[PDB]
Amino acid sequence: EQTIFDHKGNVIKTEDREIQIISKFEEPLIVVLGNVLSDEECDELIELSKSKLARSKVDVNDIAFLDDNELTAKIEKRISSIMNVPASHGEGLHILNYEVDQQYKAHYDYFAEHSRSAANNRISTLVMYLNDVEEGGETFFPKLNLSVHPRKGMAVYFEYFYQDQSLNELTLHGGAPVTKGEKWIATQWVRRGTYKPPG
Amino acid sequence: EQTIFDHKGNVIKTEDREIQIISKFEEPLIVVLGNVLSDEECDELIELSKSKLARSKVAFLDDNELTAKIEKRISSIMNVPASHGEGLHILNYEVDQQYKAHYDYFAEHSRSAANNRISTLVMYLNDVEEGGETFFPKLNLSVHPRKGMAVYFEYFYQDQSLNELTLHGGAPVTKGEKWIATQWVRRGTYKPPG
Ligand SMILES: O=C(O)CCC(=O)C(=O)O
Ligand SMILES: O=C(O)CCC(=O)C(=O)O
Ligand SMILES: [Co+2]
Ligand SMILES: [Co+2]
Numbered sequence A: 001e002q003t004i005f006d007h008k009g010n011v012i013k014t015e016d017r018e019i020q021i022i023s024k025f026e027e028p029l030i031v032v033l034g035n036v037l038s039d040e041e042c043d044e045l046i047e048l049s050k051s052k053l054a055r056s057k058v059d060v061n062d063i064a065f066l067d068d069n070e071l072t073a074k075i076e077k078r079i080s081s082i083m084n085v086p087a088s089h090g091e092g093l094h095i096l097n098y099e100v101d102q103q104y105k106a107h108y109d110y111f112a113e114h115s116r117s118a119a120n121n122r123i124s125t126l127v128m129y130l131n132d133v134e135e136g137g138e139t140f141f142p143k144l145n146l147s148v149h150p151r152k153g154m155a156v157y158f159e160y161f162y163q164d165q166s167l168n169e170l171t172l173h174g175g176a177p178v179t180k181g182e183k184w185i186a187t188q189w190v191r192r193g194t195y196k197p198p199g
Numbered sequence B: 001e002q003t004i005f006d007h008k009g010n011v012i013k014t015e016d017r018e019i020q021i022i023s024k025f026e027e028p029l030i031v032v033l034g035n036v037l038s039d040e041e042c043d044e045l046i047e048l049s050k051s052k053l054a055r056s057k058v059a060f061l062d063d064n065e066l067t068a069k070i071e072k073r074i075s076s077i078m079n080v081p082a083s084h085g086e087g088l089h090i091l092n093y094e095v096d097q098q099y100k101a102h103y104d105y106f107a108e109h110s111r112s113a114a115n116n117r118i119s120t121l122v123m124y125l126n127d128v129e130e131g132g133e134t135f136f137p138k139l140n141l142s143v144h145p146r147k148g149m150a151v152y153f154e155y156f157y158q159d160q161s162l163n164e165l166t167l168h169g170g171a172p173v174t175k176g177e178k179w180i181a182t183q184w185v186r187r188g189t190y191k192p193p194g
Helices: A039-054 A070-083 A116-120 A165-169 B039-054 B065-078 B111-115 B160-164
Strands: A011-013 A018-026 A029-034 A094-098 A104-107 A122-129 A139-141 A146-148 A155-159 A173-175 A178-180 A183-191 B011-013 B018-025 B030-034 B089-093 B099-102 B117-124 B134-136 B141-143 B150-154 B168-170 B173-175 B178-186
Touching: A018 B018, A029 A146, A039 A070, A039 A094, A039 A183, A070 A122, A070 A183, B030 B141, B039 B065, B039 B089, B039 B178, B065 B117, B065 B178
Parallel strands: none
Antiparallel strands: A011 A018, A018 A029, A018 B141, A029 A155, A094 A183, A104 A173, A122 A155, A122 A183, A139 A146, A139 A173, A146 B018, B011 B018, B018 B030, B030 B150, B089 B178, B099 B168, B117 B150, B117 B178, B134 B141, B134 B168
16 A cells, blocks of 8 residues: 655655654554654653643643644644645644553554544554653554654654555554653644644 | 563663663564664774775774674673674675675574574664665564664574564665674674683
8 A cells, every 4th residue: 555654765854854764664654763853842842731731720620732832833844744744634742741650551543433533534643752761651553563662852653544444453552651750742643634723 | 482682671771881772573573772883983893894904815893992892782782792793794885785685594404503693783884875774574674774773683583483584684775875783693602712
């Protein structure tokens, strides 16, 4: 099958940065990427997460995705070149923190048949590692026996838009328990069609 | 099965450097490793290769302090004493050069098979403009060259079909050039005593 990700060679030359292609698992397509985010961009994304939370009072505490800003739009543009899909298909920079012994149990990123979101389903994912994880925290694909270990500024790309649906089901993945330290990530989930309202 | 490479977590701490564990294919074990050699160490290994060729009596490097220090770091990574290593084998690909898919271990009934290879570390000593990936055709997996990085894999399994899955090669270099050092590790001590 043809893939969305359409990049030959060892680097991806985007407008503001050069991405390194580190390794590939060819089908379903899984790619480890280097140099995706600067150290300072990783730190700044974390900070935006903590600030948005620090502004919660009784958004209301009683009732995730960063607010759009110069930094998030610059990063979404860069991601857009990597993923070969316009930024408007992106759900936005979703920030996630794992404390020790937290994990993300294996799942599919594309939506179940019963979600209304399945009207415009997800097609591909980028997981960016915003810090270094003392122990644990690997992104693992249990049906492929593959795992990507977190590393600040690196990312894992994968897609699930294949005609053969058994290939999409191979993209079952999760975030392994953090056994020491903590883990910060940004995820960009990309939809088949435009997702953000115009701007 | 258990594996030779025995390293939990995300870094491997050696005496002089901290290696980064980047990605793992679990079986046969294939590991992408980061921060294995400094840029200075990479360049110096290339120059040693070139200088050794200059003295040509028309290649493994000769033993010196650098190679011993690197081989000691590698032994920590691979969990096997350096005396098992064949030595730093330097290899240069020019454009359109390739290493067709092969096994690193010797045929079971070859002369060298009495002390067969059990694991390989391929260290990328420069950046390759295009091509030159280390590919495992039966596994649909490739590791692209990155200066300072490396790929580890082992083929010491009881189930021989696992070892056969370690078939691999060096894809053609289509732009630039490619330099690598390889450490091939033997089941038993290999270097004469020193
Ligand atoms: O934490 C991880 O490594 C996996 C994250 C993930 O699966 C997701 O964000 O969709
Ligand atoms: O050049 C490569 O990437 C492959 C090296 C290799 O197969 C070996 O040294 O045994
Ligand atoms: Co996910
Ligand atoms: Co080989």
